[PDB]
Amino acid sequence: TGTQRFKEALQDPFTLCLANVPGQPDLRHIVIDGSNVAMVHGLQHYFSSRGIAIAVQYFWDRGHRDITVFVPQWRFSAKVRESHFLQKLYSLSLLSLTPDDRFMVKLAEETDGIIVSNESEKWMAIIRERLLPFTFVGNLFMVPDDPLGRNGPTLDEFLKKP
């Protein structure tokens, strides 16, 4: 029992260890909705920064080196669980503080651009075009193997620039 007690599924250990090796060259820039990811991991209740760290480790492990986690500036003050993961991401040039959806669309426009996330439809629509949904189990980050359905591409080719 206890919704809070169980969220200490955080006792299952996770360390952000990004292997110091160069990445593959034609992969797409991974744009991460830091808030969405952190809330999904925190069961829409906690800002669970480990959610972001886990998601970065996933793409870092596939060889992606152009990764940007957007998180609001005030999420550095703010009910944030394990904020130490944000500090580490910031200092490794993987995290930019928004001063909000427009920044991800802007960024993914400028780069090859994949958005990792679950009026003014112009901005809302652009997100649909590049959306990569996800789920967590615990520290396990899972993304669909056909990001856009069976008609659309495979995961491997969805994350390639060509």
Author numbering: 411 to 487, 490 to 511, 524 to 542, 551 to 594
What do the study authors state?
Therefore, to understand the contribution of this N-terminal extension to protein folding, stability, and catalysis, we determined the ex-PIN crystal structure that includes the N-terminal extension sequence. Within the structure, residues encompassing T411–P594 were well ordered, which includes residues T411–D436 of the N-terminal extension. The asymmetric unit comprised two copies of the ex-PIN that pack to bury a surface area of 446 Å2, although there is no indication of dimerization for the ex-PIN at up to 2 mg ml−1 concentration in solution as determined by SEC-MALLS. The domain comprises a mixed α/β fold containing nine α-helices and six β-strands. The ex-PIN N-terminal sequence forms an N-terminal arm (Nt-Arm) comprising a short helix, α1 and an extended strand that packs against the core PIN domain. Further secondary structures are arranged in two helical subdomain wings (α2–α5 and α6–α8), a central β-sheet (β1–β4), small orthogonal sheet (β5–β6), and a C-terminal short helix, α9. The copies structurally superpose well with a RMSD of 1.4 Å over 167 of 183 Cα positions but with two local conformational differences. The first in the large loop that intersperses β3 and α6 that is disordered in Monomer-A. The second in the (α6–α8) helical wing, where in Monomer-A α7 is disordered and α8 is rotated by 25° relative to its position in Monomer-B. The Nt-Arm contains 20 residues (K417–D436) that wrap around the core PIN domain. PISA analysis reveals an extensive interface that buries 890 Å2 of surface containing salt bridge, hydrogen bonds and hydrophobic interactions.
KHNYN is a ZAP-binding protein required for ZAP-restriction of CpG-rich viral genomes. It contains an extended diKH, PIN nuclease, and CUElike domain, each of which are required for ZAP restriction of viral replication. Our crystal structure reveals an extended PIN domain (ex-PIN) containing a conserved N-terminal arm region required for domain stability and an active site tetra-Asp motif, which are both required for antiviral activity. Unlike the weak activity recently reported for the PIN domain, we demonstrate that the KHNYN ex-PIN domain is a highly active Mn2+-dependent single-stranded RNA endonuclease that cleaves with a preference for ApC, ApA, and UpA dinucleotides.
